[PDB]
Design an enzyme around this catalytic site. Structure first.
Site, PDB file in Angstrom:
ATOM      1  N   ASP A 187       0.759   5.368  -0.226  1.00 25.41           N
ATOM      2  CA  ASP A 187      -0.010   6.623  -0.179  1.00 25.41           C
ATOM      3  C   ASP A 187       0.658   7.717  -1.026  1.00 25.41           C
ATOM      4  O   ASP A 187       1.844   8.003  -0.823  1.00 25.41           O
ATOM      5  CB  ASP A 187      -0.197   7.041   1.257  1.00 25.41           C
ATOM      6  CG  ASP A 187      -0.967   6.036   2.113  1.00 25.41           C
ATOM      7  OD1 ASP A 187      -2.108   5.670   1.721  1.00 25.41           O
ATOM      8  OD2 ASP A 187      -0.385   5.572   3.160  1.00 25.41           O
ATOM      9  N   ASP A 221      -8.174   0.849   1.673  1.00 26.45           N
ATOM     10  CA  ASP A 221      -7.888   1.884   2.644  1.00 26.45           C
ATOM     11  C   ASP A 221      -8.957   2.993   2.806  1.00 26.45           C
ATOM     12  O   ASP A 221      -8.901   3.646   3.814  1.00 26.45           O
ATOM     13  CB  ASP A 221      -6.467   2.450   2.560  1.00 26.45           C
ATOM     14  CG  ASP A 221      -5.943   2.880   3.948  1.00 26.45           C
ATOM     15  OD1 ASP A 221      -6.507   2.308   4.943  1.00 26.45           O
ATOM     16  OD2 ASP A 221      -5.075   3.853   4.049  1.00 26.45           O
ATOM     17  N   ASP A 262       1.699  -1.388   4.271  1.00 23.58           N
ATOM     18  CA  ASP A 262       2.190  -0.103   3.808  1.00 23.58           C
ATOM     19  C   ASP A 262       3.651  -0.115   3.391  1.00 23.58           C
ATOM     20  O   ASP A 262       4.540  -0.519   4.168  1.00 23.58           O
ATOM     21  CB  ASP A 262       1.986   0.897   4.915  1.00 23.58           C
ATOM     22  CG  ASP A 262       0.507   1.215   5.112  1.00 23.58           C
ATOM     23  OD1 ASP A 262      -0.348   0.369   4.810  1.00 23.58           O
ATOM     24  OD2 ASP A 262       0.225   2.334   5.505  1.00 23.58           O
ATOM     25  N   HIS A 309      -7.172   9.204  -0.504  1.00 26.40           N
ATOM     26  CA  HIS A 309      -7.808   9.059   0.805  1.00 26.40           C
ATOM     27  C   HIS A 309      -7.060   9.786   1.943  1.00 26.40           C
ATOM     28  O   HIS A 309      -7.566   9.791   3.076  1.00 26.40           O
ATOM     29  CB  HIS A 309      -8.167   7.582   1.129  1.00 26.40           C
ATOM     30  CG  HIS A 309      -6.958   6.670   1.107  1.00 26.40           C
ATOM     31  ND1 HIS A 309      -6.527   5.952  -0.002  1.00 26.40           N
ATOM     32  CD2 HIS A 309      -6.071   6.405   2.099  1.00 26.40           C
ATOM     33  CE1 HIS A 309      -5.425   5.265   0.282  1.00 26.40           C
ATOM     34  NE2 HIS A 309      -5.126   5.533   1.572  1.00 26.40           N
ATOM     35  N   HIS A 320       0.824  -1.201   0.000  1.00 29.84           N
ATOM     36  CA  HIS A 320       0.000   0.000   0.000  1.00 29.84           C
ATOM     37  C   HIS A 320       0.873   1.273   0.000  1.00 29.84           C
ATOM     38  O   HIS A 320       1.587   1.549   0.953  1.00 29.84           O
ATOM     39  CB  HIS A 320      -1.038  -0.145   1.126  1.00 29.84           C
ATOM     40  CG  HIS A 320      -1.899   1.072   1.311  1.00 29.84           C
ATOM     41  ND1 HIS A 320      -2.905   1.303   0.429  1.00 29.84           N
ATOM     42  CD2 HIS A 320      -2.017   2.026   2.262  1.00 29.84           C
ATOM     43  CE1 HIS A 320      -3.569   2.385   0.795  1.00 29.84           C
ATOM     44  NE2 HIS A 320      -3.045   2.856   1.909  1.00 29.84           N
TER      45      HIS A 320
END
Ligand SMILES: CCCCCNC(=O)[C@@H]1[C@@H](O)[C@@H](O)[C@H]2[C@H](O)CCC[N@@H+]21
Ligand SMILES: [Zn+2]
EC number: 3.2.1.114
Length: 999
Positions: free
Chosen positions: A62, A174, A308, A438, A60
């Site tokens: 971001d 997420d 993550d 997000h 994951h």
């Protein structure tokens, strides 16, 4: 076309009905804290009936949270993708899935040809598989549907262009709550399946108990099931390794081979797999798997493997790969397990599931509804982020509109590559796309990251203005004159609403400094629109004409500003050098209209507003300010509603017509606190300590302006300048919100009526649909808060009140006849969801709203049982006035030879429920065949039995159509060749996409 009003779909699971029966008891389930002790019959499994397990490695990433896009790229993501590339290359059976195309594009462009081709190799052989393939993995609460589709189109266009792949499986692990807008867009973009994670633990328990974790997810109005998308909801608390292998995180954590500088909270470490332990480790793990499989209807099991920013180091790839390989070799060689286990991809999982269904081993349930408001544990409902960093939430909407207008304006022509249109549009789409993340629109990122998001959006706004001005000069200059300098500012933009800001050009007119000034208005919507527009002027003696020099009725009002004397008190000051000129611009569908401001004494066709201060010099201004003791006030503009206000300048009642009743409608500001003991509210969580209490208003200064075209009531409250503007229909509400100091406070704006709404209210999802909500007294207050991305309403037998928003905020109806919407929040504590901070960085935002009271007793309403509501024509148009107003352009120079008066006067003026959501040219000048893509959305409005329209065919909008295709929403696949080259009619609540080719 289906009937979306009369017919209530039949589904196995309807979420509103589900919530009504659920008890929501937070029981201790044991090792699965929020579930129960899974039992399976071990004789279920034999050599004829094996468990098929797909271990799916993932990471994951971001695109902003704790760090900026660039920071994470440099620190984490670039290493992850280099390793993925190396490890998959050398290990043909190793698999990996990838979500966020923003980081993939960034990395891929930095590769040498060799690495580029090697990368294409592992995508072609299916080893690296792209999931969703959006620019980001977006928020699903606050995001507008147009922006969801924008970020999706951006990543998938990149994928098709660079990798010749289009994902058909979505991965959304997420976002904090899930919207049915996602299946809606995804199924119209060729998707076959999707995966979700973050749903209320109590909902996971309920569904898990009936094996309804996989479901065909359809729209709440969809009777037939045409919209349905197959959805997998993961069952446990998280997507990380402890929560993905099976029910007992203490066991699962031992199978995250990276935790041997990371460790296991449950204090049992992983162990290297060897010939010594393999039998025992295998037994432990497969037991986990078979427990998870019991929750699903097939013998095909999805086991995600990562976390993550995982798969960053060479040695993490080995430790994960080699240990699981040992496990698989042991498991698959031993018949007593009855398991086939391997590395696999998301699409591999879904294929095998659909194989099992086609063989008749399972029938899946149907589902409609949404998954808001999410709670991860006890009463920790994530309604906070419906409101956090409201300045950026509003910035999203403004930017959304500018990209639409920039892409439409420039779509009309092909542009020489020196104009740099393609580049600016590309940047603007990407910046806006990233903020869909997000941790972007949600307001859950660190301050410097929110800073990065803001600077990016700002550059994106500048890029849209540069494209829009160039396009407008081209569209309205005689072709025989048109001779552009692509770096010149032909027009400056005028925006009354963003940022709200001591910017805005004053147009300086003088009887010979500069006598007259040309202004242009753009209408992005596909019907004729009339809208009041305003400009700042250096003299009150201005008159309005069209280019034909016909008079236009105008009003002049003073420019007012509010000051906090700090000494004293919040008081207005009036300008002595700038005035507002206001008139009605009439603008063609997707078109442009030119007007002229000329200076003169007082003109024939311009009136002067009066000013009443209830508790001031005004330059060359005709009417002197009047003064007054605080009093009740009633105003009417035009034939429109009559509004009564309190002595504090807050709306008290509305009268629709001369002979209808005085309908009570009170605005009130209240404040919510944070907890004594308990959990503290943060960027994510809303944890009020009881009902909100009223704000003490004192005796504030109320400014009243009264004009023939426009009147308004403004008041300087502590924290908020509040204004009601009257133009003849539904008023507009502006709040300039400065929460400034007030720590551990949330500022709410509430409406109070006698409307007999009971426990029912209606909030929209992504600006696309309105869903029925029921207030639940069994749940805490924060659980009755829902996203308000564009509007909300309550109604009874007779009366509706609808509030439309220019910005996503949180809201509820916490008692019969009320509506309420959070304005801002300031928070000293972190809510311990990873961010490390509270929300301590607020800034002044201008919130805009429309307020629609209507009689509904002669409207065809859906039955009591329908889970959807529908806007009236008035509420729909009021929303459109908030999100897609007229654009305003001031000619920057003194003379405009070539000037034309109008563009698009021949364009068809389509039915009001129809919008051309996207117009985007798809080809550069260097292609022989020009191609333009159109997204069309048709909404559904209540028939109240309440006008002349023409058929709009996007295929013929531009000259010399050679081809027209109905396409997926991303424009990437043909779904129907249109022999006619005429676009078919679109149905209520459908969105369709067309691509037109031109010779
Ligand atoms: C290592 C840190 C743990 N990881 C997270 O907490 C992940 C991040 O991807 C980020 O998007 C964050 C959301 O803001 C809130 C829900 C959980 N999210
Ligand atoms: Zn995340």
């Amino acid at each position: 076309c289906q009937d979306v009003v009369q017919d209530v779909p039949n589904v196995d699971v309807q979420m509103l009905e589900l919530y009504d029966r659920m008890s929501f008891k937070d029981i201790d389930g044991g090792v699965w804290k929020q579930g129960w002790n899974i039992k399976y019959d071990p004789l279920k499994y034999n050599a004829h009936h094996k468990l098929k397990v797909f271990v799916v490695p993932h990471s994951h990433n971001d695109p902003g949270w704790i760090q900026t896009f660039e920071e994470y790229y440099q620190h984490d993501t670039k290493h992850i993708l280099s390793n993925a590339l190396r490890h998959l290359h050398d290990n043909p059976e190793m698999k990996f899935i990838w979500a966020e195309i923003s980081y993939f594009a960034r990395f891929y462009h930095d590769l040498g040809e060799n690495k580029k081709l090697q990368m294409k190799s592992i995508v072609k052989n299916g080893q690296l598989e792209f999931v969703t393939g959006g620019w980001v993995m977006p928020d699903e609460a606050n995001s507008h549907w147009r922006n969801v589709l924008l970020q999706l189109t951006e990543g998938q266009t990149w994928l098709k262009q660079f990798m010749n792949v289009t994902p058909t499986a979505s991965w959304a692990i997420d976002p904090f709550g899930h919207s049915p807008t996602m299946p809606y867009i995804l199924q119209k973009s060729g998707f076959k399946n999707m995966l979700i994670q973050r749903t209320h633990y109590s909902v996971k328990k309920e569904l898990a108990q009936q094996r309804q974790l996989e479901f065909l997810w359809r729209q709440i109005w969809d009777n037939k099931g045409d919209t349905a998308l197959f959805t997998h909801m993961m069952p446990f608390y998280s997507y990380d390794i402890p929560h993905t292998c099976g029910p007992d995180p203490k066991v699962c954590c031992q199978f995250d081979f990276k935790r041997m500088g990371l460790s296991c909270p449950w204090k049992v470490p992983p162990r290297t797999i060897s010939d010594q332990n393999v039998a025992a480790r295998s037994d432990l793990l497969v037991d986990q798997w078979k427990k998870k499989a019991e929750l699903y209807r097939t013998n095909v099991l999805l086991i995600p493997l990562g976390d993550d920013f995982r798969f960053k180091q060479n040695t993490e790839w080995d430790v994960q790969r080699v240990n699981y390989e040992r496990l698989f070799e042991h498991i698959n060689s031993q018949a007593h397990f009855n398991v086939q286990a391997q590395f696999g991809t998301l699409q591999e999982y879904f294929d095998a599931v659909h194989q099992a269904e086609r063989a008749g081993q399972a029938e899946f349930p149907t589902l409609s509804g949404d998954f808001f408001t999410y709670a991860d544990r006890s009463d920790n409902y994530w309604s906070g982020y419906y409101t956090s960093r409201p300045y950026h939430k509003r910035m999203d909407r403004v930017l959304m509109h500018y990209v639409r207008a920039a892409e439409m304006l420039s779509a009309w022509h092909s542009w020489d590559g020196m104009a740099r249109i393609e580049e600016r549009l590309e940047q603007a789409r990407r910046e806006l796309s990233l903020f869909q993340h997000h941790d972007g629109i949600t307001g859950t990122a660190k301050t410097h990251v929110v800073v990065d998001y803001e600077q990016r959006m700002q550059e994106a706004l500048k890029a849209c203005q540069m494209v829009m001005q160039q396009s407008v000069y081209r569209l309205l200059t005689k072709p025989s004159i048109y001779s552009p300098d692509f770096s010149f500012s032909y027009f400056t933009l005028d925006d009354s609403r963003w940022p709200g800001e001591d910017s805005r050009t004053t147009i300086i007119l003088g009887e010979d400094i500069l006598p007259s000034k040309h202004v242009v208005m753009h209408n992005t919507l596909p019907h004729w629109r009339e809208q009041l527009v305003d400009f700042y002027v250096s003299s009150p003696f201005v008159s309005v004409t069209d280019l034909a020099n016909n008079p236009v009725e105008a009003q002049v009002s003073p420019v007012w500003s509010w000051h906090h004397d700090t000494l004293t008190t919040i008081h207005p000051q009036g300008s002595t050098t700038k005035y507002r000129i206001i008139f009605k611009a009439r603008v063609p569908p997707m078109g442009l209209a030119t007007y002229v401001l000329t200076i003169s004494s007082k003109p024939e066709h311009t009136s002067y507003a009066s000013n009443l201060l209830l508790r001031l010099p005004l330059g060359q201004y005709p009417e002197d300010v009047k003064f007054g003791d605080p009093r009740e006030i009633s105003l009417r503009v035009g034939n429109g509603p009559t509004l009564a206000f309190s002595e504090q300048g807050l709306l008290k009642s509305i009268q629709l017509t001369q002979d209808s009743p005085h309908v009570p409608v009170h605005f009130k500001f209240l404040k919510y606190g944070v907890r004594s003991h308990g959990d503290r509210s943060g960027a994510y969580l809303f944890l009020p300590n009881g009902p909100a209490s009223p704000v003490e208003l004192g005796q504030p200064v109320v400014l009243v302006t009264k004009g023939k075209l426009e009147s308004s009531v403004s008041v300087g409250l502590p924290s908020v300048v509040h204004q009601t503007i009257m133009r003849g229909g539904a008023p507009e509400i502006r709040n300039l919100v400065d929460i400034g100091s007030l720590d551990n406070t949330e500022i709410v704006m509430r409406l109070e009526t006698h409307i007999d709404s009971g426990d029912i209210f209606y909030t929209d999802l992504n600006g696309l649909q309105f869903i029925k909500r029921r207030r639940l007294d069994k749940l805490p207050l924060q659980a009755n808060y829902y996203p308000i991305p564009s509007g909300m309403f309550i109604e009874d037998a007779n009366t509706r009140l609808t509030l439309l928003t220019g910005q996503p905020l949180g809201g509820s109806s916490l008692a019969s006849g009320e509506l309420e919407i959070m304005q801002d929040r300031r928070l000293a504590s972190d809510d311990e969801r990873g961010l490390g901070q509270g929300v301590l960085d607020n800034k002044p935002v201008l919130h805009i709203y429309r307020l629609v009271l209507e009689k509904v007793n002669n409207c065809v309403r859906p039955s009591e049982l329908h889970p959807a509501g529908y806007l009236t024509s008035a509420a729909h148009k009021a929303s459109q006035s908030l999100l897609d107003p007229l654009d305003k352009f001031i000619f920057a120079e003194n003379e405009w030879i070539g000037a034309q008066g109008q563009f698009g006067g021949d364009h068809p003026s389509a039915r009001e429920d129809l919008d051309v959501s996207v117009m985007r040219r798809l080809t550069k000048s260097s292609a022989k065949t020009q191609r333009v893509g159109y997204v069309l959305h048709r909404t559904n409005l209540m028939q109240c039995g309440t006008e002349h329209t023409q058929k709009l065919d996007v295929c013929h909008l531009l000259p010399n159509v050679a081809r027209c295709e109905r396409t997926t929403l991303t424009f990437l696949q043909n779904l129907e060749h249109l022999d006619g080259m005429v676009a078919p009619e679109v149905c209520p609540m459908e969105t369709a996409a067309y691509v037109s080719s031109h010779s």
